[PDB]
A paper describes a structure:
The bacterial protein ItcR is unique in its ability to bind to itaconate. Structurally, ItcR is a transcriptional regulator protein with an N-terminal DNA-binding helix-turn-helix motif and a C-terminal itaconate-binding domain (IBD)24. Multiangle light scattering (MALS) analysis showed that IBD appears as homodimer in solution. Here, we report the development of a highly responsive, genetically encoded itaconate fluorescent biosensor, referred to as BioITA (biosensor for itaconate).
The IBD was expressed in Escherichia coli and purified by affinity chromatography and gel filtration. Furthermore, the crystal structure of IBD without or with itaconate binding was determined by multiple-wavelength anomalous diffraction and refined at a resolution of 3.25 and 1.48 Å, respectively. In line with the result of MALS, the IBD proteins form a homodimer in both of the apo and itaconate bound states. Notably, alignment between the structures of IBD in the apo and itaconate bound states demonstrated that monomer in each dimer exhibited translocation of over 7 and 10 Å in the N- and C-termini, respectively.
Numbering used by the authors:
A (entry chain A), B (entry chain A): 86 to 292
Amino acid sequence: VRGELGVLRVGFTASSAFNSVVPTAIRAFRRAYPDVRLQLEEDNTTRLADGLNEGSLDVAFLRPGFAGSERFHLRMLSEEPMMIVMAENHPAASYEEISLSAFRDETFLLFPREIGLTLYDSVIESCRTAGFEPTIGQLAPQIASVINLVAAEMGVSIVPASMSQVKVIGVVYRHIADQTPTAKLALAYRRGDTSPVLRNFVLTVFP
Amino acid sequence: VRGELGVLRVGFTASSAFNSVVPTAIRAFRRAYPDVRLQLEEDNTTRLADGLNEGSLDVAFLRPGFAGSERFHLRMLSEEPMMIVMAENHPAASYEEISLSAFRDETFLLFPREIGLTLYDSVIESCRTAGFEPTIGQLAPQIASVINLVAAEMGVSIVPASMSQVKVIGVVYRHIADQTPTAKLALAYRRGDTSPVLRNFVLTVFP
Ligand SMILES: C=C(CC(=O)O)C(=O)O
Ligand SMILES: C=C(CC(=O)O)C(=O)O
Ligand SMILES: [Cl-]
Ligand SMILES: [Cl-]
């Protein structure tokens, strides 16, 4: 009955909390191991990987593919389509089918690349696969902040599909008919960290 | 034509971005002063006030009432009701009218008090006015994170009404029939900071 006491420091990105796997895993662990204290931290993949490396986090829900990710265990938990988010009165909002080529001259809002290089680069790659280099306008700190600026008609963005729960008045979400990479979420933890609390958490997320 | 170039560091809390005043003000300023670079930071009132004090922020959308707030200019921008957020299958979800006394023995999820003492204390005060001391369960980093854990049926919370745009599957928002303090948002900036860029921003938010 090891690993039933202690504190586990658990990190996740702000957008990842909107993917059901994150609350589902947290709730499942709290039920199975009620005496373990979950200290939750919300931060982007760059910071979460740094926290794992320095020992200030024990496990993270982050986006895979960052430089040096092979130094950790990463287990895929969710892959989801990306969607376009735009103002409700954007001309493309009444299109039967959305193609990214419609936005070749449109301003894209994004978050700063340095906080999450893989997801940022996947938005860029999506536009490149559609044949253009996106014009990037105002940067906002998180995807939820980006969406709120989309409501103010400052541009469009590309977001994990689960962000379509964020029904800010004046925005719409549309599926992309073009081929686009998924947004990816993995559970991440240190190699050779044999803590029984961490093991109990990992085996709760992957029964 | 002073203050039409430079960088303005503008802070706001994660939940405040969901109040229309924040995107409305940002868009209005970007239109009126296109050459000024808006560097946006999303952080809680404690950090935003510290940033103003140390000069790493020039202006913030924050919640008024913090210790030492008299050292800054605060101009009220929005007051909004607070609402209860709960799982869709919570027994109170099918009540005609919601009273906080229904939750006297219910677990409340919250964010850590230290990041935003006034809003946290106003949730506590709401329950006290309804006649009870709330039992606080799992803490999550931001209000949006709290809402996602409410979807996993880990408790209920009390949120600014504009967070009802965050339609996480499995949660519902209800108005509170009890008297509760508003959630409050003010524009905050340093006293005796005579920068023309900051002045142009303040006068855009308050035309
Ligand atoms: C902005 C991001 C990118 C990241 O942190 O990897 C997110 O919310 O997941
Ligand atoms: C959690 C808070 C409280 C604060 O930062 O004042 C918010 O999102 O506004
Ligand atoms: Cl492996
Ligand atoms: Cl004053």
